[PDB]
Amino acid sequence: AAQTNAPWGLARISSTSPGTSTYYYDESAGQGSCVYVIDTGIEASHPEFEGRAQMVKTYYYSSRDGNGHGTHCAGTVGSRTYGVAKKTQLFGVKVLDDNGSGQYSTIIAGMDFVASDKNNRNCPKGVVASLSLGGGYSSSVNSAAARLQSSGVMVAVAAGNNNADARNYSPASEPSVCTVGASDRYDRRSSFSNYGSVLDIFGPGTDILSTWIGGSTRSISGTSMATPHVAGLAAYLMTLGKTTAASACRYIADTANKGDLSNIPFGTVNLLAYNNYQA
């Protein structure tokens, strides 16, 4: 399948070169997979989600996304126009309030929720969780991410936006999950992207167009935006049967575009997520 005039990040993930604008992907499109977006919620009523999104859990007075961030991330995973995996099922878990903040204890509860809740959902092709959040190092946060991964969920987490080594942030520093840095449309490391040995992969993160609340759209930047590209890619690849939740991060690294990013510090991987789709 070919989506013309796609957001640059979608085009980038199906291309061996920057500077194109068509997204190419297998029509299976993540059907039969599920992606949990653990964030500020999801505006499931947005036409871009086509009935494939729903809120399953909140820790606050509403499950609605009063912020936009979670809706944007969910859009990059799976919206019809802005998403990598256009037929996946999206499940929202609101661990962050409408100002985008959340306690680590709530975030941990949300991760353990997903590890169990997937047994209440139909995801024959596999389960992914996208975590566009983080703060300072916490062994308990890292352990919760490790549990979620161990339970059979492909966990993708943001590297962080501090232009610093991600070893000092969580859950980015957890070795067993997929830690995602951000790049721009010219294959440069995003100016804010964290780096370091704990990163597994880069995805598009600067000037990413996606869904927003109030049935709208907007372009924002962050490792928050790169993470759902990788989560959606994992769901897409798992639906194709090319990899599994336990092996998807490594498979994405194995098949990535290699050596193509600039300003990658010595010791950080130079790997850009790539679907290797031959039309």
102 torsion bin: left (phi>0), alpha (psi -120 to 50), beta (else)? beta
Burial of 128-139, coded b for 16+ CB within 10 Å and e otherwise, reads bbbbbbbbebbe
Sign of CA pseudo-dihedral 63, 65, 69, 73 = positive
Distance, in Å, from the CA atom of 64 to the CA atom of 155, rounded to the nearest integer, reads: 23
Q: Return phi, psi of residue 128, to 5°.
A: -130, 150
236 vs 78, 79, 141, 252, CA distance in Å?
10, 13, 27, 11
Distance, in Å, from the CA atom of 214 to the CA atom of 193, rounded to the nearest integer, reads: 29
Distance, in Å, from the CA atom of 155 to the CA atom of 149, rounded to the nearest integer, reads: 6
CATH superfamily of 2-272: Peptidase S8/S53 domain (3.40.50.200)
Q: 254: Cβ–Cβ under 8 A, 6 or more apart, which residues?
A: none
Sign of CA pseudo-dihedral 28, 31, 34, 39 = positive
DSSP character at residue 168: G
Structural tokens at position 17: 């070169």
- The answer to whether the CB of 260 falls within 8 A of the CB of 187 is yes
Instruction: Give me the resolution in angstroms, 1 decimal.
Output: 1.1
Candidates 46, 69, 72, 229; catalytic one: 69
Q: How was this structure determined?
A: X-ray
Candidates 15, 33, 39, 72; catalytic one: 39
Output the CA torsion 187→193→132→259 (10° steps). 40
Given the DSSP bridges, would you call strands 271-272 and 257-258 parallel, antiparallel or unpaired? Answer: antiparallel
- The answer to whether the CB of 94 falls within 8 A of the CB of 70 is yes
140 vs 60, 112, 145, CA distance in Å?
22, 12, 9
Determine the straight-line distance between the first and last CA of the chain, rounded to whole angstroms: 7
Distance, in Å, from the CA atom of 277 to the CA atom of 279, rounded to the nearest integer, reads: 6
- The answer to whether the CB of 173 falls within 8 A of the CB of 158 is no
Peptide bond into 171 cis (omega under 30): yes
Tell me which H or E stretch contains 187: none
CB atoms within 10 A of CB 214: 9
Query: Does residue 229 have an active-site annotation?
Result: no
In the three-class reduction of DSSP (H, G, I as helix; E, B as strand; rest coil), residue 132 is classed as coil
Query: Which alpha helices (H) appear in the chain, and where do they start and end?
Result: 8-13, 69-78, 104-117, 139-150, 223-239, 248-255
Binding residues: 16, 175, 177, 200, 260
Domain spans of the chain, in order of start: 2-272
Distance, in Å, from the CA atom of 208 to the CA atom of 211, rounded to the nearest integer, reads: 10
Distance, in Å, from the CA atom of 107 to the CA atom of 112, rounded to the nearest integer, reads: 9
Binding residues for Ca(2+): 16, 175, 177, 200, 260
- Taking each helix axis from N to C end, the angle separating 248-255 and 223-239, rounded to the nearest 10 degrees, works out to 100
In the three-class reduction of DSSP (H, G, I as helix; E, B as strand; rest coil), residue 212 is classed as strand
Query: Does residue 187 have an active-site annotation?
Result: no
31 vs 26, 85, 88, 127, 155, CA distance in Å?
11, 8, 5, 11, 18
Distance, in Å, from the CA atom of 88 to the CA atom of 220, rounded to the nearest integer, reads: 23
- The answer to whether the CB of 190 falls within 8 A of the CB of 184 is yes
Sign of CA pseudo-dihedral 73, 78, 83, 84 = positive
3-state helix, strand, coil in the chain (%, to 5): 25, 25, 50
Q: In the beta sheet, which residues pair with residue 195?
A: 165
Query: Does residue 117 have an active-site annotation?
Result: no
Structural tokens at position 57: 């859990």
Candidates 130, 138, 224, 229; catalytic one: 224
Q: Chain-centre distance of CA 223, in angstroms?
A: 9
Distance, in Å, from the CA atom of 124 to the CA atom of 103, rounded to the nearest integer, reads: 32
Structural tokens at position 207: 């000037």
Q: Return phi, psi of residue 38, to 5°.
A: -100, 100
Distance, in Å, from the CA atom of 119 to the CA atom of 123, rounded to the nearest integer, reads: 9
Q: Chain-centre distance of CA 58, in angstroms?
A: 19
Residue with tokens 């409408």: 98
